């Protein structure tokens, strides 16, 4: 279990014991309980730290991107969409993972794929139920340049085929870093010269997702938008860091704008 400490009954004291006094010049932080600073009763305490595990904290699906593509190519979305895999284009999921320096985990990817009708000068629409492909292309694979090209044959590339009006499709991904954990922060460079990309984006090379309609275009236009959700599973995290204080600027840098530590108060004494 994850059950917390009980309070221990304590009486009056008058001794040379000094639990309250300490030096904080040591890296050590005090271990004092209420049973050291006042009377206290015995409390049998059944509260658990069950949901404050890192495998419950990080284990809820979070949207990491959405990308759009259009049958008509109505508003410059092409007939397929692409996304270079990263976790840093969204504030919320990024912040949770950046409370740790190294994380090894498996992922679970869920896709929520929706479509909508577009304005057109077309008359009479009775468009069949759309099918969509989501193709994962590992680093150094051939890439789509059109919706019709040979790369969508998926002979070794992992791929999902899914039809609208069905449960969101999902696939597990295993741990797959070159290292023995994913690196959230890298204080190095990509060159021995100490030039080029600086930061964690040096070590980012996680392939690219491509997504298209599998159906041929119909006389109107449909735009489909695919939202990608990652959930960490089976997590071990190492080296705790402060939570972010500043809002992010960029998905490849930590650059930040100088921001206040805390919010205002009127004075030292407030009620």
């Amino acid at each position: 279990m994850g059950r917390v400490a009980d309070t221990i009954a304590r009486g009056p004291s008058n001794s040379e014991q000094i639990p309250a006094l300490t030096a904080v010049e040591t890296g050590h932080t005090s271990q004092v309980d209420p049973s050291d600073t006042m009377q206290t009763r015995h409390v049998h305490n059944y509260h658990s730290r069950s949901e404050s595990s890192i495998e419950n904290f990080l284990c809820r699906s979070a949207c990491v991107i959405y990308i759009k593509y259009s049958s008509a190519e109505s508003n410059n979305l092409k007939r397929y969409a692409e996304w270079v895999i990263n976790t840093r284009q969204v504030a919320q999921l990024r912040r949770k993972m950046e409370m740790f320096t190294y994380i090894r985990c498996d992922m679970e990817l869920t896709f929520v794929i929706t479509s909508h009708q577009e304005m057109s000068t077309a008359t009479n629409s009775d468009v069949p139920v759309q099918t969509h492909q989501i193709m994962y292309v590992p680093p150094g694979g051939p890439v789509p340049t059109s919706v019709n090209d040979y790369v969508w044959q998926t002979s070794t590339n992992p791929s999902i085929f899914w039809t609208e009006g069905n449960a969101p499709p999902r696939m597990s991904i295993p741990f797959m870093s070159i290292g023995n954990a994913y690196t959230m922060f890298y204080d190095g460079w990509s060159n021995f010269s100490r030039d080029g990309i600086y930061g964690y984006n040096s070590l980012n090379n996680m392939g690219t997702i491509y997504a298209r309609h599998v159906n041929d275009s119909s006389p109107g236009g449909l735009t489909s938008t695919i939202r990608i959700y990652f959930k960490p599973k089976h997590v071990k995290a190492y080296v705790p860091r402060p939570p972010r204080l500043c809002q992010y600027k960029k998905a490849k840098n930590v650059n930040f704008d100088v921001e206040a530590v805390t919010t205002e108060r009127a004075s030292l004494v407030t009620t």
Partner: protein, 238 residues
């Protein structure tokens, strides 16, 4: 019926799944197996076999047999560098269309040591000595024979044994490297220098050839299947 609930991915077709499906020829009697020589069970049984390396893959030599051989001669000086190329057995021009390199371009990761065998194809009256060098990265390619012998090296002596292996060890920060060229996953440099000279009688040719072979060692593995970039089409073949 039995209460059940459908969960995400209930109707998906994942191309890397394995599920059972009804046969469309129930009770079909397959042909008996027989032993056919040369059963493959792994692609590291193909990668551990030598394959001639085109180390002389200049523009004129691509469609000829010049590609697979580098001339070496009796020099009037020490003789400089014979060749050198960045190691990276899946992204280098030199190494990526060999057996090792084309089994590598179906994968995104690789690890382990590989072995470059060299063979002298001169006369039996011709003899030489060569410095075969590997330099781990972070200091660039060696630009002198002095800097090449600070790295890993085998000094090859040409004799009755016609070949010498420079085994190039794994030596990497990460447990794996990317098949693609990536500056974080940089893999070092290979070079060859004259250690002595090719010395030969008057009545035997002053020029000789050298070939290079490459294969995986027994500590070598690959991970993460992907489509190769070396085959393509614009319409269905008919």
């Amino acid at each position: 019926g039995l209460p059940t609930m459908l969960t995400p991915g209930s109707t998906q077709f994942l191309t890397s799944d394995d599920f059972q499906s009804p046969s469309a020829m129930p009770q079909f009697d397959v042909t008996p197996e027989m032993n056919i020589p040369g059963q493959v069970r792994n692609l590291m049984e193909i990668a551990e076999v030598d394959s001639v390396v085109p180390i002389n893959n200049l523009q004129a030599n691509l469609k000829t047999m010049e590609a697979y051989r580098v001339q070496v001669r009796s020099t009037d000086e020490m003789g400089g560098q014979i060749f050198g190329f960045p190691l990276q057995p899946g992204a280098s021009s030199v190494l990526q269309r060999t057996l090792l390199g084309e089994i590598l371009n179906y994968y995104t990761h690789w690890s382990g040591s590989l072995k470059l065998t060299f063979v002298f194809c001169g006369s039996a009256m011709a003899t030489g000595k060569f410095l075969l060098a590997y330099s781990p990265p972070g200091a660039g390619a060696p630009d002198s024979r002095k800097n090449a012998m600070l790295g890993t090296h085998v000094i090859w002596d040409v004799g009755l044994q016609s070949s010498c292996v420079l085994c190039v060890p794994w030596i990497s920060q990460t447990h794996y490297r990317y098949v693609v060229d990536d500056k974080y996953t940089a893999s070092g440099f290979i070079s060859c220098w004259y250690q002595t000279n090719v010395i030969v009688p008057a009545e035997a040719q002053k020029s000789c050839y050298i070939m290079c072979f490459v294969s995986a060692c027994n500590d070598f593995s690959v991970r993460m299947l992907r489509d190769t970039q070396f085959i393509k089409q614009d319409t269905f073949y008919q």
